[PDB]
From a paper:
Here we report a novel peptide stapling strategy based on the dithiocarbamate chemistry linking the side chains of residues Lys(i) and Cys(i + 4) of unprotected peptides and apply it to a series of dodecameric peptide antagonists of the p53-inhibitory oncogenic proteins MDM2 and MDMX. In this proof-of-concept study, we firstly used [name] – a potent dodecameric peptide antagonist of MDM2 and MDMX that, despite its high affinity for both proteins, fails to activate p53 and kill p53+/+ tumor cells due presumably to its inability to traverse the cell membrane and susceptibility to proteolytic degradation. Previous structural and functional studies of [name] (TSFAEYWNLLSP) identified Phe3, Trp7 and Leu10 as the most critical residues for MDM2/MDMX binding. Crystallographic studies of peptide–MDM2/MDMX complexes structurally validated the chemoselectivity of the dithiocarbamate staple bridging Lys and Cys at (i, i + 4) positions.
Whereas all 12 residues could be built into each [name](8,12)-a peptide complexed with MDM2, [name](4,8)-a was fully defined in only 3 copies of the MDMX complex with no density observed for Ser11 and/or Pro12. In both complexes, however, the crystallographic density for all atoms of the crosslink formed between Lys(i) and Cys(i + 4) unambiguously defined the geometry of the DTC staple. The DTC staple rigidified, at positions (8,12), the C-terminus of [name] in a helical conformation and extended, at positions (4,8), the C-terminal helix of [name] from Leu9 to Ser11. The rigidity of [name](8,12)-a or [name](4,8)-a increased to such an extent that the local buried surface area (BSA) slightly decreased as compared with the BSA contributed by [name] to its interface with MDM2/MDMX. We deduced the DTC structure of the predominant epimer from the crystal structures of [name](4,8)-a and [name](8,12)-a in respective complex with MDMX and MDM2, where Cys8 or Cys12 remained as an l-amino acid residue as shown in the electron density maps.
Author numbering:
A (entry chain B): 1 to 12
B (entry chain A): 25 to 107
Write the structure that this text describes.
Amino acid sequence: TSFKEYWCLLSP
Amino acid sequence: NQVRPKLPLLKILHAAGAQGEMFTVKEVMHYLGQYIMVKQLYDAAAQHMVYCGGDLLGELLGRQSFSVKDPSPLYDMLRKNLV
């Protein structure tokens, strides 16, 4: 599981 | 709805490759994501952990490290730096 997959588990 | 960043975040946002003076919370969250990716600040093993202390990101957040599974340190800074 990459950081760019973790990051987009957050709402904007 | 737009917001103006304070100077430190602004510089970081332009360092990401964003343009302009006023941003939405949506676009600030993209370019912060873009910033960490290009600056390679996330830990290569535990990719949820970000180590920012030696960067300009660290002094802005008031931290050394943070995790994305808990982004309440992001909330701290967005509340303080986006008027």
